[PDB]
């Protein structure tokens, strides 16, 4: 709305590697996340196809399509409730203390639903899981929501 | 400028301003150099220090002159912060070729020629990127320790 | 599946395969539109709600028919979770149609025993079934009606159980019209007693 | 505690030692809501993850971002300063301090 945030246009100049002021359709998922929006990858996929837009063939972009797609994704930020994130992992391990065994969270984050690479899974556990093999998800989900 | 760094410049301003009136003149510069052992300090050196200011060297003119020369000055704790992120496993000094590649390939300020000048008085370990910490010392306080 | 063995051969007429179930309970359902309705020729047939006349209802049919019937000529339809419920009284939709319909469905599947509360509904097969099967008899032996599928020996055994457990006398009341086939059951119940405690 | 939420008739049910009691078509109602909730499913919890996953990637091609600058500028200072009277002075003098 501007509140006209012109820093979204300045961040589009940091993600366009050619400097022509266009951003390919394959970058739009990760740049919506870098502007403070977390649409799921199936949602980013649907919307695209919904609009008869094929992410399979070469794509370019213009700021005039990327701005309204970020504004259509911005209504879905009401789905980001931290009660359900901590209660999900609290149902994932027994006893009254928030600890996932290391390999349980790593294999679930790579193979269940939207596949996260094991390189990204190791980069998200690095520092929050110590050598006991127990990830405290009270501080883990706190630090994941700090970015 | 953190406040303890500004208090360090206030203490250095008081040690060079031996008349204690709040303005370092050329006599204060010469008498501070003579008290450090400089019996041969020429008047042209004192005139070149005063030629860097547009007015008398009071505390805010000394702070603005040091601000404009130290526009990338970083305290030792923030330099060791960045070097602990470059060595995230702790303790080890990072490799010579890793710092040369990461300075160049990330930024234009890390271009090579400049990397040869970094190795050139910042010795081997420092230059190489293996030790660590002595370079943070000499960036906050110059010359060999 | 794992459980069923005792019957094995009868199984198909008592219970359905664990996916037949699964394939039935876990299917698409649109509550707000799916419904049961009155019907001049056939008693109650099913349909989908099309529109809403403010206190009239227009519905499509299952056969293809469109009728605009009152608001209370229209009755909800149970989620698929209640397909061929052993105990209709567990349904969350206690209607007239839903009951007819449950019986009917599990019959077209050849299940003659369905419970409706305390009752033990029984429908005339009009053909032969491995139900009175000498294997079943045992199977139903020592089992609460929750440990086994709807069947008469359930009633008949429980009676017995209950008989010795509570130290009370029991009864079984069989009832139906002329062609319902009670004698048959009665007799069959009787054999049951004689066998299991002779 | 659960039934705490929902724009549901807090009448129609009743609790007791082993179970809740419900009027008609309720449990039916429940499920339905549930049904919608799965169409959604996981799917929402995946996303954030996905999102978040890449969000850490930026900090990496990215984390470094500033630590460099810090290093960058910081050096430059010195190269300029180290030749400045006042700074040499501070230098010889910096020790006598406490």
Swiss-Prot record, chain A:
PTM comment: The N-terminus is blocked.
Record has Ligase as a keyword: no
Top-rank lineage group of the source organism: Eukaryota
Residues covered by the EF-hand domain: 7-38, 41-76, 80-115, 115-147
InterPro entries the record matches: CALM/Myosin/TropC-like (IPR050230), EF-hand-dom_pair (IPR011992), EF_hand_dom (IPR002048)
Keyword Repeat (UniProt): yes
GO terms for cellular component: contractile muscle fiber; myosin II complex
Sorted UniProt keywords: Motor protein, Muscle protein, Myosin, Repeat
One of the record's GO molecular function terms: calcium ion binding
Subunit structure and binding partners: Myosin is a hexamer of 2 heavy chains and 4 light chains.
Name recorded for this polypeptide: Myosin light chain 3, skeletal muscle isoform
Swiss-Prot record, chain B:
The UniProt record lists the keyword Phosphoprotein: yes
Keywords carried by this UniProt record: Calcium, Metal-binding, Methylation, Motor protein, Muscle protein, Myosin, Phosphoprotein, Repeat
All residue ranges annotated as the EF-hand domain in the record: 9-39, 74-109, 110-144
GO CC annotations, alphabetized: cytoplasm; myosin complex
A GO molecular-function descriptor: calcium ion binding
Binding site for Ca(2+): 17, 19, 21, 28
Top-level taxon in the UniProt lineage: Eukaryota
PTM statement from Swiss-Prot or TrEMBL: The N-terminus is blocked. N,N,N-trimethylalanine, found in other myosin light chains would not have been detected in the N-terminal tryptic peptide in PubMed:7358336 because it would remain trimethylated and ninhydrin negative after hydrolysis.
GO BP terms: muscle contraction; skeletal muscle tissue development
Keyword flag Ribonucleoprotein: no
Quaternary structure, from the entry: Myosin is a hexamer of 2 heavy chains and 4 light chains.
Note: This chain binds calcium.
Biological function: Myosin regulatory subunit that plays an essential to maintain muscle integrity during early development. Plays a role in muscle contraction.
Protein name, as recorded: Myosin regulatory light chain 11
Organism: Gallus gallus
Portion held of the full protein: 29 to 164 of 168
Swiss-Prot record, chain C:
Domain of life: Eukaryota
Residues with PTM N6-methyllysine: 32
Function as written in the Swiss-Prot or TrEMBL entry: Muscle contraction. Myosin is a protein that binds to F-actin and has ATPase activity that is activated by F-actin.
Binding site for ATP: 176-183
Record remark: domains: The rodlike tail sequence is highly repetitive, showing cycles of a 28-residue repeat pattern composed of 4 heptapeptides, characteristic for alpha-helical coiled coils.
Sequence ranges assigned to domain Myosin N-terminal SH3-like in this UniProt record: 30-79
Species the sequence originates in: Gallus gallus (Chicken)
Residues of the full protein shown: 5 to 202 of 1939
Modified residues (N6,N6,N6-trimethyllysine): 127
Subcellular location: Cytoplasm, Myofibril
Protein name: Myosin heavy chain, skeletal muscle, adult
Family affiliation: Belongs to the TRAFAC class myosin-kinesin ATPase superfamily. Myosin family.
């Amino acid at each position: 709305s501007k509140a006209a945030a012109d820093d979204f246009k300045e961040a589009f100049l940091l993600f366009d590697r050619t400097g022509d002021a266009k951003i390919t359709a394959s970058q739009v998922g990760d740049i919506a996340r870098a502007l403070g929006q977390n649409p799921t990858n199936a949602e980013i996929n649907k919307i695209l196809g919904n609009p008869s837009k094929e992410e399979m063939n070469a794509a370019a972009i213009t700021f005039e399509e990327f701005l309204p797609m970020l504004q259509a994704a911005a209504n879905n930020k009401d789905q980001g409730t931290f009660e359900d994130f901590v209660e999900g992992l609290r149902v994932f391990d027994k006893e009254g203390n928030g600890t996932v065994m290391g390999a349980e969270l790593r294999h679930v984050l790579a193979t269940l639903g939207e596949k996260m690479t094991e390189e990204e899974v190791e980069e998200l556990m690095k520092g929050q899981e110590d050598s006991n093999g127990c990830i405290n998800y009270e501080a883990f989900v706190k630090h994941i929501m700090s970015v | 400028f953190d406040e303890t760094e500004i208090e360090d410049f206030k203490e250095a301003f008081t040690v060079i301003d031996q008349n204690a009136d709040g303005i370092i003149d050329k006599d204060d510069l010469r008498e501070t150099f003579a008290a450090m052992g400089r019996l041969n300090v020429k008047n042209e050196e004192l005139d070149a220090m005063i030629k860097e200011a547009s007015g008398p060297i009071n505390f805010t003119v000394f702070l603005t002159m040091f601000g404009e020369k130290l526009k990338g000055a970083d305290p030792e704790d923030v330099i060791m912060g960045a070097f602990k992120v470059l060595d995230p496993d702790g303790k080890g000094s990072i490799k010579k070729s890793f710092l040369e590649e990461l300075l160049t390939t990330g930024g234009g300020r890390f271009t090579p020629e400049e990397i040869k000048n970094m190795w050139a008085a910042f010795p081997p370990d420092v230059a190489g990127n293996v030790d660590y910490k002595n370079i943070c010392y000499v960036i906050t306080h110059g010359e060999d320790a | 599946d794992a459980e069923m063995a005792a019957f094995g051969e009868a199984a198909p007429y008592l219970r359905k395969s664990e996916k037949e179930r699964i394939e039935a309970q876990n299917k698409p359902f649109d509550a707000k539109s799916s419904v049961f309705v009155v019907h001049p020729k056939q008693s109650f047939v099913k349909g989908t709600i099309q529109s809403k006349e403010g206190g009239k209802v227009t519905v499509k049919t299952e056969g293809g028919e469109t009728l605009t019937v009152k608001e209370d000529q229209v009755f909800s339809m149970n989620p698929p979770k209640y397909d061929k419920i052993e105990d209709m009284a567990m349904m969350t939709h206690l209607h007239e149609p839903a009951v007819l319909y449950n019986l009917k469905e599990r019959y077209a599947a050849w299940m003659i025993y369905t419970y409706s509360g305390l009752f033990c509904v029984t429908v005339n097969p009009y053909k032969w079934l491995p139900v009175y099967n000498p294997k079943v008899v045992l199977a139903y032996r020592g089992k609460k009606r929750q440990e086994a599928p709807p069947h008469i020996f359930s009633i008949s055994d429980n009676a017995y159980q209950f008989m010795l457990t509570d130290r009370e006398n029991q009864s079984i009341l069989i009832t139906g019209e002329s062609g319902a086939g009670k004698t048959v059951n009665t007799k069959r119940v009787i054999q049951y007693f004689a066998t299991i405690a002779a | 505690k659960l039934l705490g939420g929902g724009d549901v008739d807090h009448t129609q049910y009743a609790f007791g030692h082993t179970k809740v009691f419900f009027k008609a078509g309720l449990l039916g109602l429940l499920e339905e809501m549930r049904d919608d909730k799965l169409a959604e499913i996981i799917t929402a919890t995946q996303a954030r993850c996905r999102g978040f996953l890449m969000r850490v990637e930026y900090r990496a091609m990215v984390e470094r971002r500033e630590s460099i600058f810090c290093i960058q500028y910081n050096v430059r200072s010195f190269m300029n300063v180290k030749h400045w009277p006042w700074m040499k002075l501070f230098f010889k003098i910096k020790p006598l301090l406490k």
